[PDB]
Amino acid sequence: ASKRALVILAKGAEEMETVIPVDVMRRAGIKVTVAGLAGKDPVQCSRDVVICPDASLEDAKKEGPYDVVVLPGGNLGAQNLSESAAVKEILKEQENRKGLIAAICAGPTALLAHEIGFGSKVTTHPLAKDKMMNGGHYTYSENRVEKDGLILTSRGPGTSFEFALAIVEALNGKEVAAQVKAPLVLKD
Amino acid sequence: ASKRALVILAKGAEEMETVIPVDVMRRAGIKVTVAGLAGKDPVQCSRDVVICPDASLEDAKKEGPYDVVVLPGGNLGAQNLSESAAVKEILKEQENRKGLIAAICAGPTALLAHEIGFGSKVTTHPLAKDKMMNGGHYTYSENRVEKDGLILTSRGPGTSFEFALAIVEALNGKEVAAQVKAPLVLKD
Numbered sequence A, B: 001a002s003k004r005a006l007v008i009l010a011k012g013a014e015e016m017e018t019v020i021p022v023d024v025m026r027r028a029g030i031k032v033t034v035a036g037l038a039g040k041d042p043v044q045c046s047r048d049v050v051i052c053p054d055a056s057l058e059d060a061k062k063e064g065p066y067d068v069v070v071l072p073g074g075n076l077g078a079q080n081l082s083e084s085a086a087v088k089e090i091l092k093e094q095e096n097r098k099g100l101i102a103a104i105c106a107g108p109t110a111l112l113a114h115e116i117g118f119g120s121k122v123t124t125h126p127l128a129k130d131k132m133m134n135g136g137h138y139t140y141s142e143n144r145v146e147k148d149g150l151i152l153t154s155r156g157p158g159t160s161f162e163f164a165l166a167i168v169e170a171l172n173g174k175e176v177a178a179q180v181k182a183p184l185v186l187k188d
Helices: A015-027 A057-061 A075-083 A085-096 A109-113 A126-132 A157-172 A174-184 B015-027 B057-061 B075-083 B085-096 B109-113 B126-132 B157-172 B174-184
Strands: A004-009 A031-036 A050-052 A068-071 A100-104 A145-148 A151-154 B004-009 B031-036 B050-052 B068-071 B100-104 B145-148 B151-154
Touching: A004 A015, A004 A085, A015 A031, A015 A050, A015 A100, A015 A157, A015 A174, A015 B015, A031 A057, A057 A085, A068 A085, A068 A157, A075 A109, A085 A100, A085 A109, A100 A109, A100 A157, A109 A126, A145 A157, A151 A157, A157 A174, B004 B015, B004 B085, B015 B031, B015 B050, B015 B100, B015 B157, B015 B174, B031 B057, B057 B085, B068 B085, B068 B157, B075 B109, B085 B100, B085 B109, B100 B109, B100 B157, B109 B126, B145 B157, B151 B157, B157 B174
Parallel strands: A004 A031, A004 A068, A068 A100, A100 A151, B004 B031, B004 B068, B068 B100, B100 B151
Antiparallel strands: A050 B050, A145 A151, B145 B151
16 A cells, blocks of 8 residues: 655766655655666766665566656756666656656757657746757646646756645555655755 | 766765765766765765765876766764864865865754865754854855855755755756756656
8 A cells, every 4th residue: 555656766867866765755654766777776867976776677667667757857867768778668658657757957859869748738847948849739828836737747857846845645545645745844 | 077076975964965966967968977985885875875976086086177066964074074184185276276065954063174165155954053053154044045256055854855956047047957857757
């Protein structure tokens, strides 16, 4: 009866956008797996923070399904996610079974690369808007967090807390999100 | 002409309170060293995020001095910082040379353990107030970020961004802090 979250960690990922959702989700009792795209080895993030993943993506793929798949941002991290066939397979499967997909900052551009959720309203970091909108396959929003159907997107590192709490609310409900929020000393 | 920051990482540290200041400070061009209290080995943080430090505290001690020493929170992390004689030596030295000392959430309780900055106005996480105020050696504040002399304190994970930008403003000035802040998509 425990919800499961998959966080895909690639080199160049934004470490703040990785750690905040992982931390907040585990505070909410969600079983989170931080999966390294390239394997089990430590991952150097965009600002040189080095994080040890819980498993390789290959091994984590076999222990599905996951109630949410989380794509952190970071320009180079998002590019590596966009180029990975393994990510394409995971996202298409998640879309077919109507599971939640969450991406923040530059992360949403991986959805375009893999043709995920066309027709949805999405947001990105302002610097990633043009890339996300190439072809007009999505409708753009400037909301700090945007949720359309099974696609949940957010804008940047400064929205990571709201991004993470939105995932918790979608999975465990509004009361759990509120209980997890209070000890964090968030402003609003 | 480059400022240097020391971040002391112990088991049980709050990983959000560690990664956000490290990330933000490196965005500001500060040379940050994440030093493992127990050595070079990977550190399991409070919510099971595993971070590889840049160096052992022993080795980082020899490459001082640092313009700021940063103590993350996390109840068990702060306890390990409070029990470490090496931390006591680093903090007393930093106080004598009038360098900046920054601690967030439960981190400030290490200042009491090591008799640092008595008489200063400080803040902590609400759950750490009673511990910090044992003896009445500080004056308590409920501000999200508090700076009194060379002691800079903050309340919790949700204040980490303001905590980090305050460090940047103290070291590199208000203009650099504002430039670093804008791409983060912070609310206020």
